[PDB]
Every structure is written in C-alpha cells, then in structure tokens.
Write a protein that binds this DNA or RNA. Structure first.
Ligand SMILES: *[C][C]([O])[C]O[C][C][C][N]C(=O)C1=[C]C(C2=C3[C]=[C]C(=O)[C]C3=OC3=C2[C]=[C]C(=O)[C]3)=C(C([O])=O)[C]=[C]1
Ligand SMILES: *[C][C]([O])[C]O[C][C][C][N]C(=O)C1=[C]C(C2=C3[C]=[C]C(=O)[C]C3=OC3=C2[C]=[C]C(=O)[C]3)=C(C([O])=O)[C]=[C]1
Lengths: 433, 28, 433, 28
RNA sequence: UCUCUC
RNA sequence: UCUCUC
RNA sequence: UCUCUC
RNA sequence: UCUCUC
RNA sequence: UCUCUC
RNA sequence: UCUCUC
C-alpha cells in the first residue's frame, strides 16, 4: 500500500456508516413490529423486512403499480410474512405497512439521507442467497445458453436498479444473458435500435457491453467483446460470439467481485450490542464480516425432516458468496466439510404461504468458521476468426492443475492483520454438480 | 447430465481452480 | 545561458538553504533521539524520521484523526521504528513523539520558517524509493489501465499535498490514473460535477488536466487532452481517450522532471561535516548530488540471505530516480552492471513490525558511481478521430532506434563544469520486465 | 506475461530509447 | 493480475 | 403482499 | 431441461 | 525540445 | 505509530 | 572572472 491509506480509511468509514444505518433501521423496525429478541434474530423475519424496504424504494415498479393497480393489492402498501412465537409454537401473520412509512423510517435511520448504497447491500445479500440456493437452468436454456455454465451466474437475480456495486458483483454469465436477451428482442422486432427508444437501448447496450469488457481478463476476449459491441444492429453472429465468450470464461475466468453482505439481523444485533461501525470502520472483503459472524447468533425456521447443519452451511455460503467456490477450500476455511447441493436435505430459506406453521421449528444457525480469508475480485492465472482461434489456443494451453494465488493463504481469526497465512494442502469440488 | 463445470474463486487462497477439461474442450 | 545567471544562482542558494534545513533538522532529531553515528547513518532510521516529519505537518489527516480518533492511537503523537545497536546485535523500539514537538523542531531548524519545500523534497525521495522498489500493477488493473505501462508511473505514491514539485516530477501515467479515478467517481454517482462540491471538483479536474497538457510534447496529444478537458460531465469516451493518451506516451514520451532527492541522513552528515549548502549552493539535477553521494557513507539493514550489492543498487536507483531508466546507461554511469528487478535478491528497505530483529545485520551501501550525468526533464526525439489517426501515424512512424540527446554524453566526477562529455557506445534494457 | 515495455529517459545521455514496437502497436 | 483503496 | 434447486 | 419471464 | 534558470 | 515487487 | 544555435 501507500499514501492511499487515507482513501482506504474514508471508504471504511463510509461503509461502516451504511452498516450502522442498516442495523439501526432494523432495530427501529423491530420496535415498530413488536418482535422479541428471538423473533428479531429470525432470518425469515429479516428477509421480510429487507424485502419491504427494497419494495418501498422501487420507483419504477411503484409508478407502474400506481398507474395500473393490481387485483386487491393497493399500490401504496408493502408487507410480508412475520413469524411470531407464541406458547412455544410458531405462527405466521401477514403484515401491511404504508410505503411512505417505510421510506420515512429508512431515511430517519440514515440521518435523513436516501443511502441507496445500503439498499444495494441488502439486494446483494438477497442475490447471494438466491445464487447459493436455486439454479436458474431454465433461464439458461430459454436464452439458448448451455445449462453447464452455472458457475458464471453470479448475481443473476440482481435487479437493474442496483448501481455500480451490482454490476461489479454480477458475473460474466449474467452479462451474457442480458446481452443475449437484448439481441433476441432486437431479432424479434426490427423497430428495435431505431427511434427515440433506439437511442436509449443503444446506450444501455453500449454500457453493459463496456462493463462486460472491463470484467474480462485476457486481451483476446476484451477485443472480441469490443467487436461484438461495434455492430449497429447485431444478429445471430453476435449472439454466437457472446456464447463463445461465455464458454471461454469457464477456463479464462473473468474478474468478478465477491462481497460478504450479511443479513440485516446481524447488523441490528451488532448495533444493539453497541458496536460503532462508523468509528471502527468496515470492509466487505476483510476480516470484519468473518469476525462479526463469529460473535452473532441467528435463528432460522426448520421444515419437518430437515437438517439444521445443511441449512446453516447454505446460509454461510450465501453470506460469503461461496456458492460457486471450490468445495475443498470452502470446507478448509469453515472447518466443517461442505456438502454439495445435491446432498443438502434442505429447501429454500424463505417459507411459502401454503405451508403449515405448526410442524415447523426453529434451529440456531452455526455461522462460525475455523479460519478466515480475504475475498478476491480476481480470476486466476489467465496468462473475428483470429480472435476465436487465439482464445481456443489459450484455453487448450490451460490445464486444471495450474496453481493460482501463489503464496496467498488463509488466516486465523486471531490474526486480524493477516500477518501469517496458512497455505492449504489438498474429494468433490463442485457445488452444483 | 448437466451440472457445474468450472469454479469461480471467491476466496484469495492458493488453489488450482479445477475445471472439467474434456467436456469444455469437446465443444470445439 | 545568459544574464539569467543571477536567477540561476538565487535558485541554487534557495535549494541549498532547504538542504541545510533538512540536514540540521536531522542532526537535531538525532541528538533528541540519542542515536550514535552508526545508527544515525542507518537508512531505516532516516526513513522513520522523515515519515514522522511528514506526518506531523499533514493538515487534513491530522484534522480528520482529531475529529475521528483512531483505535488506541491518539491523534497528537507520531512515531515509528527506531533501530538501535546494542552489544553487537540490532534491536527495534517504537518511539512516540508529540506532533507539536516535531513541528517546533522542524521550524527551529529552518529559522522559524515552515519551508514546505523541504517536506516536498522528502516526499519526493520517498516516492522515488517506492517507485524503484514496488510495482503498483494492482492499482493499474483496478483503474482499468494496462499493467504494461508501468514506466509511466513515476511519482505515483506522491500525496496530493505536494506542490508544483510533485506535479512536475509525477509521470503521465499517474496523471491519467488520477483523471480516470475522477471519471469513475463521476460515473458511479451523478451528483458529482454538481453543486458546491461540483465547483471544487471541476476546478481540480481543470487544473490536473491542464498540467497533464503541459506535460506532453507533441501537438496532437496536447489537443486531445484539451478535448478531453472540455467535456462538462465526462464519461466512458473521455476515459477511453485518456487510456489512448497514456498508451501513446510509451512511444511519444512526455516530459517528466527527474530530481536526485537524497535521504536525510546524507544531508545531516554533510551539515555535520561543515558543508554550507547555503554558501556553495545546490542543484537537484547537476553534479551536486553525485558528488555528495561519492563522499558519504550510509548503512542499511540486510535481511538474512540477502545481497548488499542488490540493495545498494536499489537505493542508488531510488536516489537518482533511475527506476524506469534504460539499464545500459544506468550500468554505464554506475560502472557496475545494474540487475533488473526480477533478479534482485532483496525486499523493500522498510522493515516490517512482524520481523525478528536478531537475524538481521547491517551492510554499508555502495552509493558510488564511476561517472555522473545531468538529469533531464525532457522526453526524446518526439518529431477526436482525426487526432487519434494523427497520433497513430506518429507512433507508427517512430522506431526503437532513433538516437535522442544527440551530442550529449556522460561526465567524469573530476569534470565539475561538464566540459568534456563521454558519449557511450552500446543486453537487457528494462528494469521491470 | 506483463512487464515494462518503454523507457523513461531520466539521464540526459545520447541514447536510443528502446520500446517494444510489435506489442505496443498490436493494440491498434 | 487486483491480500482489501466500494 | 408470489414462488422455485437442476 | 424451460411449472408459465411471448 | 528543456546540458541544469526549482 | 500499517504493509507490499509483478 | 560561466556557457550554449534549435
Ligand atoms: C465497486 C467498484 O469497483 C465497481 O467498479 C466497476 C463498476 C463500474 N460501474 C459501472 O460500470 C456502472 C454501470 C451502470 C449500468 C448502466 C449505466 C448506464 C446505462 O445506460 C445502462 C446500464 O446498465 C447496467 C449498469 C449496471 C448494472 C447492470 O446490470 C446494467 C451504472 C448505472 O446504471 O448507473 C453505474 C455504474
Ligand atoms: C519545478 C517547476 O518547473 C514545475 O513546473 C510545472 C508545475 C507547475 N505547477 C502546477 O501546475 C501546480 C499544480 C498544483 C495542483 C493543483 C492546483 C489546483 C487544484 O485545484 C488542483 C491541483 O491538483 C494537483 C496539483 C499538483 C499536483 C497534483 O498531483 C494535483 C498546485 C497546487 O496544488 O497548489 C500548484 C502548482
């Protein structure tokens, strides 16, 4: 590092203040919903609260709902399931809040500031949970992409309203999906790329293709994506080139940011415990999330005949965005063997409406890791016919044995300054296999 | 049967980044 | 030259008085820290002293630290490692000084004057050391720039508080990095370039772009940078133009000032030896630094299994800002073959806290050169679509064989007046390759 | 593999200022 | 080649 | 104010 | 492997 | 085209 | 009052 | 009490 330490501390202060805003907003909403400590630590209650906040600030959807009211749902109220424990058993109740009220509470929590960064953080946490839980092979096959490249679908469920953080965290496969959807839309109707809407669509196409270009690593991919962007009315050839680019990302990996976006319950508990994230600072890639997870208790609803350990592992991988990570390193860091998706005896965290909340129980989630490591936004050792041939040569030269991140290991929770790394010595390796 | 074929390295840890080479290169 | 000799002598007197201030400040601080002659000549002790001085006068960081106190570090004290030799072996101790005390000592050394020029000199020495030691390819890739243009990263670690000297010595690549960071910041948040802060940010953008314009050599680059500056809310097109401008600087080199900013230990030894820099004068580009280095002994700490010759070469290149210079001319001037960075068996000069100061030894640094030469602020023989095509034509016309600095050679240490140059006759040529 | 590609002339000495022409011009 | 500077 | 690993 | 996103 | 005039 | 060649 | 076309 260098004199950029001051810049590195201002960013820490800003992210700490956003975490403080999230936590104290959760505290205020828990007080306004009359939830006890146990219910306030429920992951489903936190998910519902977060979804209500995100729905309250959705400008486009709210405007459309206002202009086209839904069936029996007024466009000025939000809500979701609230799980409250009475006489030992759980019970769900649908709550309804005015969206102006939710926006006012959120603004008051952040000292009268909009703070869209906090909303983006909550959305990224939701996207990480969805990526760690569900496979969207249906959207892959519908768009023509191979369902085998599910490892490139990082941040696929993120809405467009996410800012630069959403673009940074979303993977190459999702960018290819968005571009291919635009290609198909232009193929269906030729009035696309033409007129006043043509300008806006071309601008959006330009911008998404530019940031996909910035996402790649090697020069050949970075030039083929530029060739794809240059075509004014792209057709099947550009779609095929994008397919090839996505396929090449499995070996020539692209740089995708990974951040530890925790559920709002953890931040609320930390703020209630007296932690000042504004003073101490925060970092989504450092020890700060791992340390916070170590000292926090979070409860979750367990469906009948389900394993709490599997659900805790799922929630942990969602928290650390380790859905597509190598299983060996995930198990090494966590200290408990991480079971692939096929052998997880658990369904999604969110509980459907058509469920009987009388055979359901709550289990404490073990969000503890034996070691901690720094999350990276980098790929690995990545060292129109001409570009395709060059890329094929590069992929053929690569092997699944080259060692990447040489000299970088895993640290202990006591090693806050990352002084002494532990290089692992190395079973299954794919989660979604 | 389809499934995950590559690995995306979220953690900065000395690794080998596995991928299923015969199936990926079979497409060309 | 001409009647500007008097002006050329006043500048010499002023820089001599700043060198005298630095040296006698170092002498006073050595007396206040109770360091012997051997410890006073240690390069690590000088680095620590210089860092304490620079930290004491940092207005913005001190104000922020005062308003937001750190964890266990009061914002009114500075310090750093002090290496003292006892019973033959070395030993480190963390020293702590009041910042008011350091400012008072600095002002008393410079006859009650602030003398920010001396602080800028110390900062430039630190920046030259950092450039000669470490590669910031990480900041290059993070900002989107190619990590191949590391030769344009001269003066990258310089803080913003450096005056006109910092802007003169910093390279074209660092200016492009600063501009690109501003571009990215404006792209992320559109409230940039708008409001009261918008005025300040536009003013800073204007000024940095103007001095980048002044840094270039050919008219086409000087006009493209002006085109980039004119856009009120610059976006991706301006960022791409800046990338192209930086890439063109590898062939159409820009004028970057090079100065020999020596460590404070050398100036302190010279002041103790009785040299009057105020009377004799000084010049950061002439023989004065080379002559001073010839007569000075400086010691440095050698880690176990390290080569003192490689560390001495690194310190020499840091002193003369020859990090990005052609290796052939550097070896010709020094008289000893200069080994590229990849084959240097040495780590950085600064010793980390998590090091065992009992297997470490001290070695005398050979800061002697067979010849001496005048450092130049010039490029070489450098003789929106239209501007880009013109620049591409200019770069294609250029070859890596054109002889620049025709008739200008290297002088002997006896030739103080540069009467008889020695044109070298010409192996590796890149340090960071 | 990346690395230094140009030379910045700190010293005022008769030189040729090497640079790797094929790699620099390959970008265009 | 991003072990942290969103 | 919906839901679903493949 | 498309239980709905033409 | 800055072989010294920060 | 930190640290690191790529 | 110096010197140099670009
Ligand atoms: C954290 C950090 O590092 C990050 O970095 C990277 C990122 C950058 N940023 C960017 O790129 C951005 C983008 C965006 C977008 C857009 C724009 C414009 C238009 O038109 C369109 C678009 O689209 C999109 C995006 C994002 C995401 C997605 O997905 C899509 C932005 C906005 O939007 O604003 C910003 C930034
Ligand atoms: C030595 C000699 O020769 C030198 O010359 C050249 C230089 C001149 N100067 C200049 O340019 C300057 C600059 C500056 C700056 C600024 C200003 C203003 C605003 O706003 C902003 C800015 O920024 C910057 C700078 C510098 C550097 C950097 O980096 C950035 C100055 C101040 O600041 O003061 C001065 C001078």
């Amino acid at each position: 590092t260098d004199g950029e330490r001051q810049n590195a501390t201002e960013i820490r202060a800003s992210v700490g203040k956003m975490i403080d805003g999230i936590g104290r907003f959760y505290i205020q909403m828990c007080t306004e919903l009359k939830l006890s400590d146990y219910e306030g630590r429920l992951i489903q209650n936190s998910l519902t609260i977060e979804r209500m906040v995100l729905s309250a600030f959705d400008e486009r959807r709210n405007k459309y709902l206002e202009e086209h009211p839904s069936a029996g749902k007024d466009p000025k109220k939000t809500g979701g399931p609230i799980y409250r424990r009475v006489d030992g058993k759980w019970r769900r109740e649908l709550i309804l809040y005015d969206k102006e009220e939710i926006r006012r509470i959120w603004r008051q929590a952040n000292n009268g500031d909009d703070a869209t960064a906090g909303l983006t953080h909550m959305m990224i946490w939701h996207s990480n949970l969805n990526d760690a839980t569900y496979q969207r092979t249906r959207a892959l096959v519908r768009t023509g992409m191979d369902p085998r490249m599910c490892s490139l679908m990082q941040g696929s469920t993120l809405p467009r309203r996410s800012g630069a953080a959403g673009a940074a965290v979303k993977g190459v496969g999702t960018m290819v999906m968005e571009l291919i959807r635009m290609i198909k839309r232009g193929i269906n109707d030729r009035n696309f790329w033409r007129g006043e809407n043509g300008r806006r669509t071309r601008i959006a196409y330009e911008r998404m293709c530019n940031i996909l270009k910035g996402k790649f690593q090697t020069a050949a991919q970075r030039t083929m994506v530029d060739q794809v962007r240059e075509s004014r009315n792209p057709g099947n050839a550009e779609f095929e080139d994008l397919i090839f680019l996505a396929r090449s990302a499995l070996i020539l990996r692209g740089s995708v940011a990974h951040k530890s976006c925790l559920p709002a319950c953890v931040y609320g508990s930390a703020v209630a415990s007296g932690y000042d994230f504004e003073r101490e600072g925060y970092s989504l890639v450092g020890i700060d999330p791992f340390r916070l997870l170590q000292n926090s208790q979070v409860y979750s609803l367990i469906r009948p005949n389900e394993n709490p350990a599997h659900k805790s592992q799922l929630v942990w991988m969602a928290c650390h965005s380790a859905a597509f990570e190598d299983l060996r390193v995930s198990s090494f860091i966590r200290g408990t063997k991480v079971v692939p998706r096929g052998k997880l005896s658990t369904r999604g965290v969110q509980i459907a409406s058509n469920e009987n909340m009388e055979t359901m129980e709550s289990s404490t989630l073990e969000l503890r890791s034996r070691y901690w490591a720094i999350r990276t936004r980098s790929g690995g050792n990545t060292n129109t016919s001409d570009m395709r041939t060059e890329i094929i040569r590069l992929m053929e030269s690569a092997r699944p044995e080259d060692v990447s991140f040489q000299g970088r290991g895993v640290f202990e929770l006591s090693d806050e300054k990352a002084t002494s790394p532990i290089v692992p010595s190395f079973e299954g390796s794919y989660f979604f296999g | 049967s389809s499934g995950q074929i590559s690995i995306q390295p979220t953690f900065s840890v000395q690794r080998n980044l596995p991928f299923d080479r015969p199936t990926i290169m079979a497409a060309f």
